[PDB]
Write a protein that binds this ligand. Structure first.
Ligand SMILES: CCc1[nH]c(=O)[nH]c(=O)c1N
Ligand SMILES: [Cl-]
Ligand SMILES: [Cl-]
Length: 148
């Protein structure tokens, strides 16, 4: 048995959807990310209200790719006035992350997990910065960690 994830009771988990493999590569290399304006606001609020009591996890997936590509933890609030044009298309600001898992996990492994906060759609049909309920997030994390 593996009961690790089933015992975490603090933490918030968001889907990250990127159009760009370049941005993913840059994020892994430099441990930074940037979302949309409303995406940045959502993550920032979750980071600041969490007050170090638990992690904010980011489950990354390239739009159209058919798989998730890894997991990172948010590691700073959003800095909204930073150098422009560092990403594939010319985004306002930056926050620190720490990538803790880089592995392709097919959507087939995950599509049976549905989000009650998103019309019961499969977690694999999420938009950028879709939040995941913690009990579903525990299931997703365990599948990602278990995939070979
Ligand atoms: C700048 C990183 C980023 N952030 C986002 O929210 N959507 C994307 O497609 C993407 N490449
Ligand atoms: Cl890894
Ligand atoms: Cl699919």
């Amino acid at each position: 048995e593996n009961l690790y994830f089933q015992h975490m009771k603090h933490g918030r988990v968001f889907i990250i959807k990127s159009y760009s493999e370049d941005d993913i590569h840059r994020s892994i290399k430099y441990n930074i990310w940037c979302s949309t304006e409303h995406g940045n606001k959502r993550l920032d609020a979750a980071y600041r209200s969490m007050n170090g009591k638990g992690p904010v996890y980011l489950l990354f997936s390239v739009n159209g790719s058919g798989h998730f590509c890894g997991v990172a933890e948010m590691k700073s609030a959003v800095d909204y006035n930073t150098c422009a044009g560092v990403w594939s298309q010319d985004w306002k600001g930056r926050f620190d992350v720490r990538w803790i898992f880089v592995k392709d996990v097919p959507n087939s492994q995950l599509r049976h997990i549905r989000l009650e906060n998103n019309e019961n759609k499969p977690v694999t049909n999420s938009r950028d910065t879709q939040e995941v309920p913690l009990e579903k997030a525990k299931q997703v994390l365990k599948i990602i960690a278990s995939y070979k």
